Enzyme design. Structure first.
Site, PDB file in Angstrom:
ATOM      1  N   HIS A 177    -108.266 115.003  21.863  1.00 32.72           N
ATOM      2  CA  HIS A 177    -107.874 113.498  22.902  1.00 32.72           C
ATOM      3  C   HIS A 177    -107.941 112.202  21.643  1.00 32.72           C
ATOM      4  O   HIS A 177    -108.567 112.957  20.964  1.00 32.72           O
ATOM      5  CB  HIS A 177    -109.004 113.248  23.864  1.00 32.72           C
ATOM      6  CG  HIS A 177    -109.037 111.710  24.242  1.00 32.72           C
ATOM      7  ND1 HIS A 177    -109.610 110.889  24.328  1.00 32.72           N
ATOM      8  CD2 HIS A 177    -108.008 111.771  25.594  1.00 32.72           C
ATOM      9  CE1 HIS A 177    -109.585 109.779  25.631  1.00 32.72           C
ATOM     10  NE2 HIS A 177    -108.040 109.780  25.666  1.00 32.72           N
ATOM     11  N   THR A 225    -104.090 105.075  24.160  1.00 31.73           N
ATOM     12  CA  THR A 225    -103.809 106.538  23.600  1.00 31.73           C
ATOM     13  C   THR A 225    -102.646 105.741  22.087  1.00 31.73           C
ATOM     14  O   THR A 225    -102.582 105.688  20.898  1.00 31.73           O
ATOM     15  CB  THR A 225    -103.160 107.816  24.298  1.00 31.73           C
ATOM     16  OG1 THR A 225    -103.843 107.733  25.600  1.00 31.73           O
ATOM     17  CG2 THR A 225    -102.460 108.117  23.342  1.00 31.73           C
ATOM     18  N   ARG A 262    -107.097 103.876  10.417  1.00 35.07           N
ATOM     19  CA  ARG A 262    -108.633 103.666  11.155  1.00 35.07           C
ATOM     20  C   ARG A 262    -109.655 104.940  10.314  1.00 35.07           C
ATOM     21  O   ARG A 262    -110.460 104.281  10.655  1.00 35.07           O
ATOM     22  CB  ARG A 262    -107.886 105.124  11.630  1.00 35.07           C
ATOM     23  CG  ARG A 262    -108.884 105.729  12.848  1.00 35.07           C
ATOM     24  CD  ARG A 262    -109.973 105.035  13.687  1.00 35.07           C
ATOM     25  NE  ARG A 262    -111.275 106.314  13.904  1.00 35.07           N
ATOM     26  CZ  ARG A 262    -112.021 105.493  14.010  1.00 35.07           C
ATOM     27  NH1 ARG A 262    -111.864 103.904  14.335  1.00 35.07           N
ATOM     28  NH2 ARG A 262    -113.555 105.977  14.229  1.00 35.07           N
ATOM     29  N   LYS A 305    -112.715  89.620  49.308  1.00 33.38           N
ATOM     30  CA  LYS A 305    -113.507  88.328  50.386  1.00 33.38           C
ATOM     31  C   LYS A 305    -112.948  87.847  51.667  1.00 33.38           C
ATOM     32  O   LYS A 305    -112.081  86.945  51.731  1.00 33.38           O
ATOM     33  CB  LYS A 305    -114.173  87.218  49.655  1.00 33.38           C
ATOM     34  N   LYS A 352    -107.247 103.655  35.524  1.00 30.36           N
ATOM     35  CA  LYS A 352    -108.021 103.074  37.151  1.00 30.36           C
ATOM     36  C   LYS A 352    -106.805 102.557  37.274  1.00 30.36           C
ATOM     37  O   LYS A 352    -106.349 102.354  37.521  1.00 30.36           O
ATOM     38  CB  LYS A 352    -109.654 101.953  35.717  1.00 30.36           C
TER      39      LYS A 352
END
Length: 540
Positions: free
Chosen positions: A241, A339, A214, A439, A525
């Site tokens: 976080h 994460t 990182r 649809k 989500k």
């Protein structure tokens, strides 16, 4: 195929030797030697803390913890809102190889317990306002032997502060600059244990190596920030976080000034961007939506502002463009990260922006999209599950190898569970499930709309709308529903309720399947594929 696997380019700054604590120690020491170099600035109280002060306190904490008896067989928890003291115990632990487990400070005692039950810390560093909760948790976790108050100089309510604790363990004649950080295997030694979908949150073990990788990204002119003197960042994202954690540690390596905010406020935010001559601002997703609504931006001199970032959180083309337009910037920096990947592995490259793209594969990494059925690597512009491989992937979930294996395959690829695709230029696109559309005989309806309606009912706790495939009409809007505890409701009642709210084209003809939990994805989500599966299996 080979050419179907997207690889990140060569990093501008090679991965350096040493543990994350050694690299941090090395960087901060040189900055500490230059009086006045600002490490953190609290925007609320306006207090600045220099690299010298930070380096010295972190080194003192490292030694004090070492003397106390902590080593690689121990873990500590840091539970606090963003503050000037937050990273002191973090750096101290990394210096000696003690694993740091950041606990979300707005976790209620139940979520708090779960997290620490996984991390099993010997020592807990907490802010004054988190003390009561931590004490209640201590009663249930015998491994917690010592509680230390972060935001205090003297003792606080019978507990030692980081300052008095240090004094109780440092050997006489201790020299902060003679201190040498511990050396150890950066692959097996865990640096951070971060909290993660469905079920209870897990502990993500991240070896020192991931932070080291990182640090390369952090100073990359294309995938991070050029190390330019007097660079200031305004961070409103939580330090406990991955976004806040890994951006900050990188900033420390770069010698930047990290201006923090623990409570969002429109005017204080914009005035801070102005006054601190901020070059980069980090926002959580819902704050991007907020700024798209802001009409006060033009009142501030934001001439230095160049970057607004979302970290590992993907943003809709609409919100991104709206925010960039408001801040008069050509675009915004976003990326895709979990994460489980430490930080963003797909990032918007400097000078390589493309409308709607989440970014490109970061150095050291490679990504691909696989067939949801055959698992075979797909090609250009073909939608499939995003899989990534690199030295930043977690070593695994703490005490849960089953979950680890279900996510990371034999070849080291982590299956994100998210659908995406890459184009002729290697730009990636994350398929927005909110734009999915069902649809019914040509007529289109967004699942989010129907979910909004269902969630609106007093009896419904959660709902997930997906299209139950039907040959005679294309798709039949259906939903998995989680009722509020203690309340009873029939499929018919739900269907009828939906009907009394939408056009004859948007009716829940597919029906309702009562579930105890709506399937979520690692992104945070809803998982349309699993909802679809449940609906199918249930409907004969």
């Amino acid at each position: 195929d080979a050419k179907n696997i997207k690889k990140g380019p060569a990093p501008f700054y090679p991965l350096e030797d040493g543990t994350a604590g050694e690299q941090l120690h090395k960087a901060m020491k040189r900055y500490a030697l230059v009086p006045g170099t600002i490490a953190f600035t609290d925007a609320h109280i306006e207090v600045n803390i220099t690299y010298a002060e930070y380096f010295e306190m972190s080194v003192r904490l490292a030694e004090a913890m070492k003397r106390y008896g902590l080593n690689t067989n121990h873990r500590i928890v840091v539970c606090s809102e963003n503050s000037l003291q937050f990273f002191m115990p973090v750096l101290g632990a990394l210096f000696i190889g003690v694993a740091v487990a950041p606990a979300n400070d707005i976790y209620n005692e139940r979520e708090l317990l779960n997290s620490m039950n996984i991390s099993q810390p010997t020592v807990v560093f907490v802010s004054k306002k988190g003390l009561q909760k931590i004490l209640n948790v201590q009663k249930k976790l015998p491994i917690i032997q010592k509680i230390i108050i972060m935001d205090s100089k003297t003792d606080y309510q019978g507990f030692q502060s980081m300052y008095t604790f240090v004094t109780s363990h440092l050997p006489p004649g201790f020299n902060e600059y003679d201190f040498v950080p511990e050396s150890f295997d950066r692959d097996k030694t865990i640096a951070l244990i971060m909290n993660s979908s469905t079920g209870l949150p897990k502990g993500v073990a991240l070896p020192h190596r991931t932070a080291c990788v990182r640090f390369s990204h952090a100073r990359d002119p294309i995938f991070g920030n050029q190390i330019i003197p007097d660079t200031a960042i305004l961070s409103v994202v939580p330090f406990h976080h991955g976004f806040g954690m890994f951006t900050t540690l990188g900033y420390l390596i770069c010698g930047f000034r990290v201006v923090l905010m623990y409570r969002f406020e429109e005017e204080l935010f914009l005035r801070s961007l102005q006054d601190y001559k901020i070059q980069s601002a980090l926002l959580v997703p819902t704050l991007f939506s907020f700024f798209a609504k802001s009409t006060l931006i033009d009142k501030y001199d934001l001439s230095n502002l160049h970057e607004i970032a979302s970290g590992g959180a993907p943003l809709s083309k609409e919100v991104g463009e709206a925010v960039a337009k408001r801040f008069h910037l050509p675009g915004i920096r976003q990326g895709y990260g979990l994460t489980e990947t430490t930080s963003a592995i797909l990032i918007t490259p400097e000078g390589d922006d493309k409308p709607g793209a989440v970014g490109k594969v970061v150095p050291f990494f490679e990504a691909k999209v696989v067939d949801l059925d055959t698992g075979k690597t797909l090609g250009v512009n073909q939608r499939g599950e995003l899989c990534v491989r690199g030295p930043m992937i977690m070593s695994g979930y703490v005490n849960n190898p089953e979950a680890t294996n279900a996510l990371i395959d034999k070849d080291g690829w982590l299956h994100s569970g998210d659908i995406a695709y890459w184009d002729e230029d290697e730009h990636f696109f994350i398929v927005d499930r909110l734009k999915s559309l069902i649809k019914y005989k040509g007529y289109q309806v967004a699942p989010a709309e129907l979910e909004s309606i269902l969630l609106q009912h007093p009896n419904i706790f959660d709902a997930g709308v997906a299209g139950l495939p039907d040959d005679d009409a294309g798709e039949l809007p259906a939903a998995v529903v989680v009722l509020e505890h203690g309340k009873t409701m029939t499929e018919k009642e739900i269907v009828d309720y939906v009907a009394s709210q939408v056009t004859t084209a948007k009716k829940l003809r597919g029906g309702v399947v009562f579930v105890d939990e709506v399937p979520k994805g690692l992104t945070g989500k809803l998982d349309a594929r699993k909802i679809r599966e449940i609906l199918i299996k249930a409907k004969k």
